[PDB]
Design a protein around this ligand. Structure first.
Ligand SMILES: Cc1cc2nc3c(=O)[nH]c(=O)nc-3n(C[C@H](O)[C@H](O)[C@H](O)COP(=O)(O)O)c2cc1C
Ligand SMILES: Cc1cc2nc3c(=O)[nH]c(=O)nc-3n(C[C@H](O)[C@H](O)[C@H](O)COP(=O)(O)O)c2cc1C
Ligand SMILES: Cc1cc2nc3c(=O)[nH]c(=O)nc-3n(C[C@H](O)[C@H](O)[C@H](O)COP(=O)(O)O)c2cc1C
Ligand SMILES: Cc1cc2nc3c(=O)[nH]c(=O)nc-3n(C[C@H](O)[C@H](O)[C@H](O)COP(=O)(O)O)c2cc1C
Ligand SMILES: NC(=O)C1=CN(CCc2ccc(O)cc2)C=CC1
Ligand SMILES: NC(=O)C1=CN(CCc2ccc(O)cc2)C=CC1
Ligand SMILES: [Cl-]
Ligand code: NA
Lengths: 351, 349, 349, 349
């Protein structure tokens, strides 16, 4: 118990996080029909900020109303989102955690019901690289034109500055899980004939353009995250080695960190699920490309998070479903590693 | 799907899972080094605990290579009966039986931890004439003939373990003992052809590794435990280990078990869960030699995670099996795996 | 401060703590009921696990009083060697050795649980000729001359158990076996002086309890395991047990171990952590007899709470010690108490 | 600080002190020469007495090389079990176990000293055909095939002695026995290359030393017992010893044990405390070979003085350890040195 990296400060860009634990973005589908933050978020996120994560990335917030996953996703497309979003960042920061947010566009997977309300397509005019339905039941995606694509690119750009204006000091771009920019990367969803399809370089283009545009509007001090599905898991698709080329180019545009996810591009696919099953993607990127990486995927234990950080597999450990069932897990993880957690004075007698 | 409980192919054998018990001295052997009743309950219990492999404690290849007077020994062929019966009823529980061959070098001749743990003043040997610490006998610098005599003890000691049924041989080259002492320059400042350079410090250890490898058939994996770092500056570094592994890998060693420390006491170690995993990860990925992870591996999720990340091929468990012998069995059901329980205990799972 | 690991004084002995191993059949004895190598690893393992007391599985006092052909036996004097070594092997590990004397009655002569567990058609005995359930042999009602043989078989078993070093003897009168079947009216509709009234149905069991207390010296506590309820209508009630216990406390029984069920299968049981604790609780406070808690007691905090709450004096552990033999050792340190661990494992704690 | 109780480094060994037990026949072996229960208490007791080294009695390499029918033997491998158990019970008590390999030559085949001691008429061997004395069988001169027969019997006897764990082997070339008889001209009037000249008289003996040296590793010291003088006129004198010693020094022999007499009986010996020390002193200083002092050394102060004067490196005790087995332990306290005593005896010192 002479040491603990999980609760050693992590320096990204120009701020220092109290530890190496972050909350993975997780949609609560509790926003308004116009996408405003509601009372639910103002208890959900601030609770987990008191839970001790150094960083909270609140759920995927769509930069276009029809780029939303569900009708009740958070939004950042209108300047009337700032009041609700501004207070969200304020009540997260007050609780102790740095507030960061994920900018997203659901692409051909846009317009789904709530997971507990069915999760059935609603019939929106979804967009995407090529006109291939995500699966049976989904609207036939509309191949996006550069005019369109510039609108999305500028939706991510204005969406980011809107997030910064709200106080969010970390921005993650959703380029995973078969959503818009992930759809452009994996060949299971993009068989485009233009300069944004065919070759690997062409298919990484639009995505890499969005990354460039956002980098320009985010100051150096604030780290720019990018979440990517490191593999689609279906053959003739996005491979691990393809990601290292993609990761190389993002590190080279100035992106500060990677969040290594997987899957989502298609359904007829098998994923090797296990504790830390996506860690090999974070490890490969960090060591073979030199870009900071974030590990996620059934990370549920203090010792497991600490071990992959010790092993140099990642710089930041993101927690998802563990923080839904256990919001104050990070506080107890610190005490489970011989580290005194900086707990609120009202709770100091509870530790 | 858990990698922790998928068979692992090493040499010419298959282990029921990727969990092994790290070698751990019980200081309960006889004064002649024979297996006692203690081992015949200690080791078989942890094998029933579900480990794919049981690595028996450091067993001295020479009476003067023992840590304590009650260490296990393999220097006489009258050790075979007790050792064979131990390895036999290790198989009884399900786990592959393995043994660690060791020579305590300048750290030889200490009492038991609960009897003081203090040197007894043997004529210990070593690379250079430096006591391990205050109180320890000054080791006698070994001559070429002296170390070659050691090597034949490791070779015949290996030959003896095979005769007894041990299917895995690990050479203890870590923790400041004889062959570890030759590797680290903090205890080997020799002026001859066996000191100074890394190659000179690696010669005798690799000479023993090659000599033993020749008597161990390809099918049976030859392990090597090494202190991946002295932790003292200007000492054995991770990158020195990275050369040692490349050179061990070329000799036929099938897997490296990466530990650290032990060469000296005046030093700080960044102690934490899986703090030595970075050494296994570095060796496994940068040299291509199979590696075993050890060091505060206490949870099912972390063991599987370092395996998933490709940091190691085999997970070694130490102090966890002292307090929790049946941990591997309960770890499996905690990972969705049908434990491999005995029929008499299935009503308990 | 944990009382769970405070010494318990029973009769004339002191136990290192208030944790005991519940009797658990391994069905690994010989066809004559001799202790095998399994028992000599099973129990000695859990004794090192830190339980203050080990109650070995039900050992039949009559060959046809066995549950399985491979149950332990205490009917022949050739059991002493194996039984004596078991107690010797348990005491060395730290735990006091105790044994459960049993007669399976109408449930006697079943296969192994992992071999089908279906009857083998023995000439089982019992109070009344009622099958445990369909498929089972209907027991032959015993005569007074017949019953005296069993009474002397239990006295014989206790006298023999003492010779072997077992310092605590528990009489199995629960779970629908011979004496439990005599207690619950769902299996005892006898017309003579050993059926009908509660007193008549309690008669033969108390005769055995009395007869054994006589052969067992004062210093050694005599336990009795009872099915505190049968979960069956028109059967052994909670309050019937308090009358039965009030009588056993008069007879010299030093402690009651309260389980439940077993008399019949077609019944409801409220499964839950410590669901049988209320039966242990009721006996201790309303009668004044020491009681032992059993029934899904699996955590350190839970054991200490029921002892703190005064529901029992001893906590018996079953399936937890099959999956975690060393659980008591980790439970003490998980309660801020330094556990007395073997020196070989102190660096694992 | 007394030098008598300073560690002695001879070979690759370190002895707890400079006290050793001189070889002393008990004539208590079996008729086949196996170790008996007597030896398994005799020597281990004196090892507990604190001597750094135990040199076991004269052990015959040939049935007709025995002094008495009840001498120890090393000619058949069925002596090994008994010899191995002796060597370990000596080692367990604290002292290094050593053995004297011997051939009684023309003095072979005598009764026990307390049974008459009269010859039995064996076909004893020797250099020349001269009886040891009236009544003894006339020895048959050995041929080179005959002498090689013994030389290789001495060699395997050493290889056999090492195999049993004895870490010091002494070749008995004194007291008028086979190899001593070749040395003294009063018993060797041979006409060939093994009599007459000193070299010749030294030829066959040096051949055995060389042959044994080759099979004994450097780490184990090879001792040699010599009658430093026969005491008979015109016979083996001290200066014959210094010539003999210098050449053994070069074979690699690690130490000489200087005795005297035995070649013939009709001669007077200057009996006195340390009367044979002058031979040990002369050899150590004039030849440079380590030496062992023996001969009526009975006090702690006297032993320390001859060691201080550089008269010897090792002090051997004979009749003193028969009447006073624990003499060395009390000699340490008689010199202000804390003797490492068994813990059971610490309150007696
Ligand atoms: C309700 C739920 C909502 C989620 N929403 C998102 C999301 O909006 N963006 C994203 O990148 N991952 C999302 N995830 C995935 C998690 O962030 C995380 O990658 C996944 O759960 C693996 O890590 P974990 O097992 O620790 O949760 C969601 C997961 C769940 C259960
Ligand atoms: C009592 C104890 C005895 C040990 N004996 C040995 C040994 O004989 N040889 C060796 O290479 N490591 C030995 N170790 C070290 C372990 O094998 C392991 O490398 C170290 O304890 C870290 O593993 P762990 O933290 O998972 O237990 C011992 C450790 C302990 C606590
Ligand atoms: C394999 C197994 C064997 C058992 N054998 C016996 C027995 O022989 N005699 C007895 O009185 N209870 C026996 N029991 C019941 C236990 O002693 C105990 O009453 C039950 O397990 C509830 O406690 P637990 O949940 O801690 O295991 C056995 C239970 C199991 C799972
Ligand atoms: C019974 C007795 C047996 C002996 N046996 C041997 C022997 O086997 N080999 C030998 O070299 N000296 C033998 N010796 C001589 C002693 O080892 C020693 O040299 C001699 O006694 C002088 O030493 P001391 O007077 O202190 O005893 C024996 C002496 C005695 C009294
Ligand atoms: N509700 C969810 O989990 C979703 C799956 N992946 C990411 C976004 C939402
Ligand atoms: N008893 C121990 O822990 C030891 C430490 N290093 C290796 C051997 C034993
Ligand atoms: Cl564009
Ligand atoms: Na469009």
């Amino acid at each position: 118990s002479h040491m603990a990296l999980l609760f050693t400060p992590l320096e990204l860009g120009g701020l220092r996080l109290k530890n190496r634990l972050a909350m993975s973005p997780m949609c609560q589908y509790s926003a308004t029909l116009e996408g405003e933050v509601t009372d639910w978020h103002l208890l959900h996120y601030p609770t987990r900020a008191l839970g001790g994560v150094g960083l909270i990335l609140v759920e995927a917030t769509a930069v276009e109303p029809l780029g939303r996953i569900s009708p009740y996703d958070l939004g950042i497309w209108s300047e009337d989102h700032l009041p609700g979003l501004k207070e969200l960042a304020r009540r997260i920061r007050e609780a102790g955690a740095v507030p960061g947010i994920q900018l997203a566009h659901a692409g051909r997977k846009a317009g789904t019901a709530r997971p507990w309300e069915g999760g059935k397509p609603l019939g929106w005019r979804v967009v995407g690289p090529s006109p291939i339905p995500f699966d049976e039941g989904y609207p036939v995606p509309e191949p996006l034109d550069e005019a369109g694509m510039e609108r999305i690119l500028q939706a991510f750009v204005e969406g980011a500055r809107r997030a910064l204006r709200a106080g969010f000091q970390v921005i993650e771009l959703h380029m995973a899980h078969g959503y818009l920019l992930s759809s452009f990367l994996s060949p299971l969803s993009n068989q485009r004939t233009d300069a944004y399809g065919g070759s690997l370089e062409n298919r990484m283009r639009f995505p890499l353009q969005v990354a460039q545009a956002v980098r320009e509007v985010v100051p150096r001090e604030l780290p720019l995250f990018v979440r990517v599905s490191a593999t689609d898991w279906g053959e003739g698709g996005w491979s691990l080695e393809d990601t290292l080329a993609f990761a190389r180019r993002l590190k080279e545009l100035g992106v500060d960190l990677l969040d290594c996810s997987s899957g989502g591009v298609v359904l007829r696919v098998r994923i090797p699920l296990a504790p830390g099953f996506q860690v090999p993607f974070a490890d490969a990127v960090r060591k073979r490309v030199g870009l900071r990486t974030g590990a996620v995927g059934l990370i549920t234990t203090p010792e497991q998070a600490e071990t992959l950080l010790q092993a140099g597999s990642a710089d930041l450990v993101l927690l998802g479903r563990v923080l839904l069932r256990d919001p104050y897990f990070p506080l107890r993880a610190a005490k489970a590693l011989g580290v005194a957690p900086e707990v609120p004075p009202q709770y100091q007698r509870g530790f």
